[PDB]
Design a protein around this ligand. Structure first.
Ligand SMILES: [Zn+2]
Lengths: 141, 116
């Protein structure tokens, strides 16, 4: 099996890091310097560091050479044991389902548990079921 | 290839059969590269919006499905290398799963994610 190696990145720059590495691979698979990498695992839950999957530590070193994202951790490649190739794929309960229970972030009903009614296929807005807590314009001026 | 790479990070989805992670443009212009004769999602947006959903967790850079541990685990070793997903939530309606069994395509629940 290929082995999992951990590498540092700046906060939130992991998504641009992932797509450019894929494109790098495709950009170098036909030259004299190919990539020995199998896959790169980039979980939605983690922050600050990402997972690159290859047979030996020399392979990742010679692959992530020239990228300005993975420059900062380039000097070290903390590995995980064989038993940790499984728990990386595990996802605890995307997060888009009607007739469900979601909460707010912003607005007036902060940290108030609400309900979804309809989902818009344009991925622009979403329908919510909350309760108004205004004064009906009696207390405020 | 250059078609399996999502162009833009905005408006990306994932399939329920091969977990194909692409842009809304690619699903309509090109469609599912790992299944085009059973799904036929190239040339429209209703079939792209019907089977394929946005509700998914996690990305993987599938490069060598013939030799990889991850590929075997997700049963994606008989697919084309590219952008894949690990947990694609949802379910197909009872209108396209009945035709898939008669043609020899076993629709499997790709949702490897645990529920509570
Ligand atoms: Zn598929």
């Amino acid at each position: 099996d290929p082995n999992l190696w951990t590498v540092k990145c700046k906060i939130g720059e992991e998504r641009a890091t992932a797509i450019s590495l894929m494109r790098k691979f495709i950009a170098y698979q036909f030259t004299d310097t190919p990539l020995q990498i199998k896959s790169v695992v980039a979980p939605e839950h983690v922050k600050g560091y990402i997972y690159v999957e290859a047979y030996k530590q020399t392979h990742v070193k010679q692959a992530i050479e020239g990228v300005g994202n993975l420059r900062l951790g380039y000097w070290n490649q903390q590995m995980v044991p064989i038993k940790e190739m499984t728990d990386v794929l595990k996802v605890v309960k995307a997060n888009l389902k009607p007739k469900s229970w979601v909460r707010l972030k912003r607005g007036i009903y902060k940290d108030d548990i609400a309900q979804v009614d309809y989902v818009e296929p344009s991925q622009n807005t979403i329908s919510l079921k909350m309760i108004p807590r205004i004064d009906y314009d009696r207390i405020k001026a | 290839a250059l078609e399996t790479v999502p162009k833009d990070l905005r408006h990306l989805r994932a399939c329920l059969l091969c977990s194909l992670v692409k842009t809304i443009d690619q699903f309509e212009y090109d469609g599912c590269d790992n299944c085009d004769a059973y799904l036929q999602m190239k040339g429209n947006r209703e079939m792209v919006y019907d089977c394929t959903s946005s509700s998914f967790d996690g990305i993987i850079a599938m490069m060598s499905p013939e030799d990889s541990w991850v590929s075997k685990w997700q049963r994606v070793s008989n697919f084309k290398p590219g952008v894949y997903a690990v947990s694609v939530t949802g379910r197909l309606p009872q209108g396209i799963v009945r035709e898939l069994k008669s043609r020899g395509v076993a629709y499997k629940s790709r949702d490897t994610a645990i529920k509570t």
